Amino acid sequence: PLSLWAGWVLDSSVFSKFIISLIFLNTFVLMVEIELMESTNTALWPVKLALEVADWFILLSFIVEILLMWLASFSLFWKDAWNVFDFFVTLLSLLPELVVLLGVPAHSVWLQLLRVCRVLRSLKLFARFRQIKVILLALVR
C-alpha cells in the first residue's frame, strides 16, 4: 500500500476524471452561492445550503487528497516544487472550516483570500495543455 496506492490512484484514469470533475464542479458552484443568500426562492434555499456543504465535502476530499499525499514521501515533500505551494493552498483552504468552527467570523475573516487561493490552485491544476505549457516556459525564462 502507501506509495504503491498513491501510484495506482494516480495511474487510474477514473480517479483523475473524478477529481477534475469535482474541481470544475466546485469552481462553477463557488460563484453561484455568493449571488443570493436570501428568501427569494424558499424551495431553493435548502438545496443551496446543500451545495455549500458539497463544497465543504470538496474540502474533505482535499483532506483525503493530502492523506494520499502523506502516503507519498512524507517529510521529503515539505520542501519541493509548486506541489508544496499547492499543499499550502489546500491548507489555507481548509483553514476557513477552523475559523468558522472556533473563530466566530464576525470580524476581518479574510475567507475570501483563501477562497481565491483555492480557486487559482484549481484553475492551475486543470491538466494544462502543452500549448499553455510552452508559452508558460517562455514566460518563466
Binding site: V119, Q131, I132, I135
Partner: protein, 251 residues
C-alpha cells in the same frame, strides 16, 4: 434519380449557381444596404420588407436546392453549416411572423431585435458569397499570414480569460458591501474588469474609491492592472511580430 440525379445536380448546380445565385445575392445585398441605412427607411418601410420576404424566399430556395443536393460533404463545409443555421432561423422567424395571433409581446420587442440581427448575419453571408471573385492576392497572403499562428493566440486568450476571471472573483470578493452598485452582478463585474483592462476611468475608480473608507484595494487593483497589461499586450505583440517575421524571412 439517384447518382444520375446527383451528377445532373452537380453540373446544373455549377451552372445555375454561377448564374442565378450571384445576381440575386447582389440584388439582396443592394436592397439590404439600402435598408439598414437609417435615413432612407422612412423613404420606404413598405417597399423594403416585401423585398426582404421575397429574397428570403429566394434564400430558402437556395436551402431547398442544397438539401436536395449531395448532402454530407455539403454539411462538411463550416460556411455551409452557417448557411443552414441562418436558413433555420429564417424559416423560424418567417413562420413566426406568418402565424400572427400569438400571446407574447410585440411591436419592436427583444425577439424582433434578435430577428434583425438575424438579418444582419444574413447580409454578412451575402457579402461573403459575393466575394468569390477578386479577393486580391496581397490581402489574401496577409490574411493567411494572420491565421498562421492560431494556437499561440488561442493559448494567450485562454490565459487572459483565466486571469480576468481570477481578478473578477477576487475583486468581487474584496468589494463586498463597498458600494457594489456599479458591478452588483457577474456581468457588470466582468464589465468593470474589462474597463480596468482597457484603461477606462480606472483613475476615476481610484478617485471615487478614495472617497470610500477602503484604501488598500487601490494598490491591489494597481498591481493587477499593470501586470496583466504588460504581460498580455507584450505577449500578443511579440507573438504576432515573430509570426510575420518568419514569413518575412521566407520568400
Amino acid at each position: 434519380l439517384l447518382g444520375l440525379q446527383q451528377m445532373i445536380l452537380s453540373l446544373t448546380q455549377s451552372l445555375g449557381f454561377e448564374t442565378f445565385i450571384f445576381i440575386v445575392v447582389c440584388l439582396n445585398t443592394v436592397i439590404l444596404v439600402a435598408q439598414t441605412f437609417t435615413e432612407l427607411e422612412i423613404r420606404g418601410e413598405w417597399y423594403f420588407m416585401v423585398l426582404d420576404s421575397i429574397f428570403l424566399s429566394i434564400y430558402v430556395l437556395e436551402a431547398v436546392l442544397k438539401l436536395i443536393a449531395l448532402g454530407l460533404e455539403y454539411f462538411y463545409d463550416p460556411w455551409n453549416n452557417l448557411d443552414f443555421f441562418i436558413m433555420v432561423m429564417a424559416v423560424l422567424d418567417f413562420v413566426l411572423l406568418q402565424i400572427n395571433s400569438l400571446s407574447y409581446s410585440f411591436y419592436n420587442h427583444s425577439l424582433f431585435r434578435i430577428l434583425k440581427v438575424f438579418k444582419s448575419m444574413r447580409a454578412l453571408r451575402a457579402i461573403r458569397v459575393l466575394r468569390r471573385l477578386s479577393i486580391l492576392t496581397s490581402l489574401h497572403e496577409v490574411a493567411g499570414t494572420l491565421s498562421g499562428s492560431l494556437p499561440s493566440i488561442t493559448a494567450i486568450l485562454t490565459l487572459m480569460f483565466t486571469c480576468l476571471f481570477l481578478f473578477s472573483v477576487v475583486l468581487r470578493a474584496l468589494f463586498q458591501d463597498s458600494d457594489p452598485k456599479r458591478f452588483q452582478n457577474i456581468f457588470t463585474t466582468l464589465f468593470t474588469l474589462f474597463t480596468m483592462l482597457t484603461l477606462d476611468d480606472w483613475s476615476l475608480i481610484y478617485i471615487d474609491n478614495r472617497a470610500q473608507g477602503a484604501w488598500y484595494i487601490i494598490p491591489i487593483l494597481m498591481i493587477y492592472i499593470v501586470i496583466q497589461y504588460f504581460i498580455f499586450l507584450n505577449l500578443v505583440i511579440a507573438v504576432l511580430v515573430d509570426n510575420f517575421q518568419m514569413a518575412l524571412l521566407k520568400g
